Amino acid sequence: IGSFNLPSNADKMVITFNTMSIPGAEKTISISAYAIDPNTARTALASRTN
Amino acid sequence: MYVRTNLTILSPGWLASMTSADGTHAYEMQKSPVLLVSWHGKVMQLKVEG
Amino acid sequence: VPKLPCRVDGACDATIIKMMTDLNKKGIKVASVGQNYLISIPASALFADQSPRLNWASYSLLNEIAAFLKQFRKIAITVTSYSSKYVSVKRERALTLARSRVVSEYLWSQGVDSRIIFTQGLGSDKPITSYTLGGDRSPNARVEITFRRAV
Amino acid sequence: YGPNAKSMPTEEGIPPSANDLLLHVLEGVPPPGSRRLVVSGGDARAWLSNEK
Amino acid sequence: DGCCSKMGGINYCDSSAGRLVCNNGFYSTCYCTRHAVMDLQFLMGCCLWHGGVYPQLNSSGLVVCNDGYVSEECSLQK
Amino acid sequence: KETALSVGAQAGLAWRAKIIDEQLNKQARNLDAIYDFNSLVLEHNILPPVLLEGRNTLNLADAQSIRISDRTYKVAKQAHFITTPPTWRQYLWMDYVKPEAPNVTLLPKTKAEKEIWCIYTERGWKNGIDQANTILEENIARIKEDFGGMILYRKLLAMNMVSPPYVSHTDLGVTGDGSEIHIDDRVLRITALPELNVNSAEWRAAVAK
Amino acid sequence: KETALSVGAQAGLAWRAKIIDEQLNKQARNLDAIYDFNSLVLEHNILPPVLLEGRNTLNLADAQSIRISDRTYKVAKQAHFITTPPTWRQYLWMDYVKPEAPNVTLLPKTKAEKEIWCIYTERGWKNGIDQANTILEENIARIKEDFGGMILYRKLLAMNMVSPPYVSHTDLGVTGDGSEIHIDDRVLRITALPELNVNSAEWRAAVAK
Questions:
Q1: N or C terminus: which one in chain C shows less Cβ crowding within 10 Å?
Q2: What is the DSSP string of G86-99?
């Protein structure tokens, strides 16, 4: 579970993902990390921009 | 028969046995006039009357 | 279906029925009572005349009858040979035993997975036709394979 | 025996006879609390109660 | 597909032998219940002939059967 | 999704159960003919107990410990009094409830959805069928077990290897105060439960001809 | 890249496992005729023990210090009960499951990427094949060592150097209370584990013709 960011310019988007939980036993770690494009090595979003 | 020794009885059988820490064995077993024992690797007969 | 086998491997009822009708059209006797099956083959179309020798065409018949016999799950097979009264008792008896040995050996080399192959021959003790004019051509001399399909 | 009797000797006797739930298992009554099991390839049933 | 094909046809699935009954009185070549007699020789699965697969969620790629012996082909390759 | 599969499993369980109860009701008379109990009842309206016999048993207790027994006998349920012969309807009659709730959320809209709907529904259906048959065979096994134990008690009593039940009754005339009266008093008690014997002389060997 | 290597190793390992298992199952009967065990078990169904043989052993401790033994004998695994003869199936079978999980990460984009994906899968296939071959050879060495220890014990007991195991049995009549009975009880114990002697007199030699 997390959220996204709002950049100054709309050529990209990053994702705020921190709420990481492994099931089964009652635990939930708090690791936050950032996002890169799979298979393209970028930091943007695949959508339209016009 | 209640027989106490340091030998170990092999052939004619037993029902209850107590082995202590020092090396003494007490056998509670069914009545029999002929016993078979082994002194640490050698085999002998025990003939007990009554 | 992906792990459960739907039918028994290497058998089809249409194949069984068609090849059984082909055998009956060939004239080899085929009979089915209950869970039991009896196949009777005349001696003249199989062996040499009163002698344990094989024509080269007979291997084709043995081939197709083994292919039919692989279609059923089996447990025990019995092979029994019958002859004509020719010279003695024991000559005919040993001829029957040799014939049974040859056919049983070739079947056991072929693909029937029987747990048991029993083989014996009795010469000319029990006939099935009182008309005994012919020699090896007469139908009272033959071989039979009898077996029971189980479960 | 006093308070520091460390060498208490080993006591043993008759092994157990048999496990008595096998009667119910043999007859066809599954034991209490068990789970059903799936058997493929034959005419058999099975159960699991206590990791046995 | 037709278990009693080119004959009388399907009667019912007898659960005693686990077989279809053809309308002509023969037991079919097919099967209909899992409690039948199949010639089973080949299997799937991992940690066989041991305690089975221990079903816990492991931190690593190691997977060990319940007897303590491991299976490196069940484990990954690194 | 899987909801169609689960509700189809429920529906198949219900339909197989209804047909099973129909067939079990329709075959009626021979059922209670073969499962008599009132012919098997004892003297004082006592339900006779149930016995279990095991033959040729081996136990491995652990590494290097084995025990071998020839025949073992066990009393399962202790006998007691009763007022009615038990019948098979408290062993075999399955429950039934019509499932009236197909949850109208995941109705199909495309033909692929219809396809997966159909296939998941039928495999759930066959799951429910097999589950119902499993319940039925467990019930028939348990009632077979009960009757087998009862008749084994009967033949052990024939073979003189169990004590019969023992009963004392006490008798009184009129009792009570001037406002509440009873004409008679019969108090019926059992002191000795039926049980196995351990000695060697009383064993009664059988024969046939 | 790394995905290609991982799935190449997995697919090669699985396919080689399938081929080896199929060959091993197809040659079935002579395998069991070779590794019979039931023609080796003793009288009381005790599995005979495992022994090991070493000849002309030299140990250098350090300088000014060496020891030489002409022959060594080691007990490996103690003899104990079995309720079944073991087979080769728990020693020779290997597990197998086709992995079908591709997750496209280092993307096959160009034809160059497609072919480097191909050749990395090729070398992964090579590695998986060699891994499976190594595992199979390790297992067959293991079963060879076990059976060799067994038959070595048999010939040593023939050679009169290992004491045979010794077993008592104790009988009991009808047992238990009036609730549970057993007809006869027999308890089978052993006392002497088999072991090697040290005396010089009891040795026996053999000579053929």
A1: N
A2: --SHHHH---B---
Q: Which residues contact G14 (CB under 8 A, 6 or more apart)?
A: E73, G96, G97, G98, G99, G128
3-state secondary structure of C38: strand
CB G157 within 8 A of CB G164: yes
Residues F42 and F48 sit within 8 Å (Cβ to Cβ): yes
Strands (DSSP E) contained in C75-127 are 76-82, 116-123
User: Three-class SS of residue F166?
Assistant: strand
Contacts of F96 (CB under 8 A, 6+ apart): F14, F17, F18, F21
Give the rounded distance of the alpha carbon of D43 from its chain centre: 24
Give Cα C135 distance to the centre of its chain: 20
Taking the C-alpha atoms of residue G4 and residue G106, their distance in angstroms, rounded to an integer, is 9
Residue type, F153: Y
Residue count (chain D): 52
B13 contacts G189? CB cut-off 8 A = yes
φ, ψ at C117 (rounded to 5°): -115, 115
What distance in Å separates the CA atoms of residue G9 and residue C116, rounded to the nearest whole number?
46
Amino acid present at F13: L
Q: Closest CB to G168: pick one of B13, B38, B41.
A: B13
- For residue B8 the two structure tokens come to 């170990």
As a whole number of angstroms, the distance between CA E35 and CA E31 comes to 9
Any B CB within 8 A of G170 CB: yes
| Number of C-beta neighbours around residue C119 at 10 A | 21
Residue B28 has a CB neighbour count (10 Å cut-off) of 13
CA distance F107 to F3: 10
Q: How far is residue E76 from each of residues C113, E56, E70, F108, G11, measured CA to CA in Å?
A: 41, 16, 12, 41, 11
Q: For tokens 């019948």, what's the residue? A: F87
Strands C116-123 and C76-82: parallel
Residue E35 contacts D, CB cutoff 8 Å = yes
Judged by 3 or more CB pairs under 8 A, whether E touches G is yes
Q: Name the resolution in angstroms.
A: 4.6
* Cα–Cα distance measured from residue D23 to residue D20, given in angstroms and rounded to the nearest whole number: 6
Rg (CA), chain E: 21
Neighbours of G192 (CB within 10 A): 15
Chains touching chain G, criterion 3+ CB pairs below 8 Å: A, B, D, E, F
Strand ranges (E), chain G? 46-47, 50-62, 65-77, 80-81, 166-172, 180-182, 185-192
Picking from E1, E21, E29, E44 by the largest number of C CB atoms within 10 A of its own CB, the best residue to mutate is E29
Place of tokens 């008896």: C93
CA D11 → CA D6, D8, G196, distances in Å?
14, 9, 29
3-state SS, residue G140? helix
CB-CB neighbours of G162 under 10 Å: 23
Residues G177, G171: Cα–Cα separation, whole Å: 18
Neighbours of chain E (3+ CB pairs under 8 A): C, D, G
Question: Burial, C92: exposed, middle or buried (Cβ in 10 Å; 0-12, 13-18, 19+)?
Answer: buried
Query: Strand G80-81 relative to strand G185-192: parallel, antiparallel, unpaired?
Result: unpaired
Indicate the SS3 state at residue C100. helix
Query: How close does chain B come to D52, measured CA to CA in Å?
Result: 29
3-state secondary structure of F156: helix
- Assign residue G52 a region: left if phi > 0, alpha if psi is -120 to 50, beta otherwise? beta
The tokens for F158 are: 């024939």
Task: Report which of C132, C126, C145, C124 is spatially closest to residue C46, judged by C-alpha positions.
Answer: C145
Query: Residue C59 gets which letter from DSSP?
Result: H
Rounded to whole angstroms, the Cα distance separating D21 from D49 reads 11
Interchain CB distance below 8 Å, G106 and A38: no
